[PDB]
Amino acid sequence: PRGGKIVVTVRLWDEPIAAAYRQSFAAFTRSHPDIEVRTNLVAYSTYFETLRTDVAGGSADDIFWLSNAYFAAYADSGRLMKIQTDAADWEPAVVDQFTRSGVLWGVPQLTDAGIAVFYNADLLAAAGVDPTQVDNLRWSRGDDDTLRPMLARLTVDADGRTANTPGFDARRVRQWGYNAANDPQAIYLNYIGSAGGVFQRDGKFAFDNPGAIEAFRYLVGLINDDHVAPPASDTNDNGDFSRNQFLAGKMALFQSGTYSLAPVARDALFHWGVAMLPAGPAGRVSVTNGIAAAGNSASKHPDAVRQVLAWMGSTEGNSYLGRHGAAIPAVLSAQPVYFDYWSARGVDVTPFFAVLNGPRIAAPGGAGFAAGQQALEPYFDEMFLGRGDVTTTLRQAQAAANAATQRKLAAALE
């Protein structure tokens, strides 16, 4: 029989990406035939709880995915290999999310990239707007704003009147300008970062601050006063509403991430493209998130783990994760396979990546986060419906969100 290979295990939570890794590792083992890599797919819902007990019990895989909201505890407690290499070919946003105490604690694998603005070029042309104009847009609570008049021109009622025109009837809107809504990823986290505010800090909700107040007041205005985005009752409990209106030819600008590329490309019958995120008072600040693979410091085969991590961080190894156009390599030299997948389909994905070259805001998360996000949602729904006031809602919602998180964490300790 042939020689026994050293077996390295890799843990993750995403089924299609697990399938791409299996392809990547088959290629690794052809050139490194002394090592066999096995993937271990564990469901996301219990991933971090099960990792914590496996690592504590000395039964964790050799390599495992981490997110920004959970890596620190592992790094601080010596559970992770230091990643000792230059980071120049790795997405900086992802490197930054796994750097602690001056050390990088995982090999960047995937990025969400940034948020951008899908546009219906036929509706822009109908309004006399060139697609290039959508890259010049600025939102502001002050007189320097240019987003609001653009959105008003792109919002039209059944009689053909735009949102800026006397006699416009918001009850009879047939086409919206935009998708402002109670939507953290596509909308409000970007508005908060673009106003210099935070959403989460040190594991707690922290969105009751001046930057966030400005962001939410602007969004409440777009929806309830300008009528350039759908009423909040259409979007508060219905995360696909705006994408569905965009696909139906009823929305000019649709701000979203690369997660909307596949459904838009599959169904849109009109001419469409992607433009930059609008700049706010602190600049164009997008939400982003990344995933890195950490090496288990307790591995029985550390040299093999280091070889497998070098492969995973390489052009060839990481290209496998992007070649179906469904996930974005964090290795910069591997990103062309994702760009080329999309450009073959007529989509230039540049704006999702260009926005990362600036200030950013992290996607929030962490232990007990889901409980707190669930708690704030009814308060945010009323705010986006134009009821009460932004300041009093944010105060109350933050207290409710933190209380729900803390209960969940207390229940876990006991």
Numbering used by the authors: 34 to 447
Lines from the paper:
The fold of UspCNt follows the architecture of periplasmic binding proteins for bacterial ABC transporters, consisting of two subdomains or lobes that enclose the putative carbohydrate-binding cleft in the centre of the molecule. In conclusion, our data strongly indicate that Mtb-UspC is a carbohydrate-binding unit of the essential UspABC transporter system, with a substrate preference for sugars containing an amino group at the C2 or C3 position.
UspCNt readily formed crystals in vapour diffusion experiments using a commercial sparse matrix screen. Phases were determined by single-wavelength anomalous diffraction data to 2.6 Å, exploiting the anomalous signal from bound iodine ions. The structural model was refined against a native dataset (apo tetragonal) to a resolution of 1.5 Å. The UspCNt structure determined represents the ligand-free form and the model comprises residues 34–441, plus six additional residues of the partially ordered C-terminal affinity tag. UspCNt crystallized in two different crystal lattices. The tetragonal crystal form (space group P41) contained one copy of UspCNt in the crystallographic asymmetric unit (ASU), whereas the monoclinic crystal form (space group P21) contained two copies. The subdomains are joined by a central flexible hinge-linker that is localized around residues Asp145, Thr321 and Gly379. The molecular surface of UspCNt shows a prominent cleft between the two subdomains, which is characteristic for periplasmic substrate binding proteins of ABC transporters. The cleft is lined by several aromatic side chains, which affords the potential to form π-stacking interactions with carbohydrate moieties.
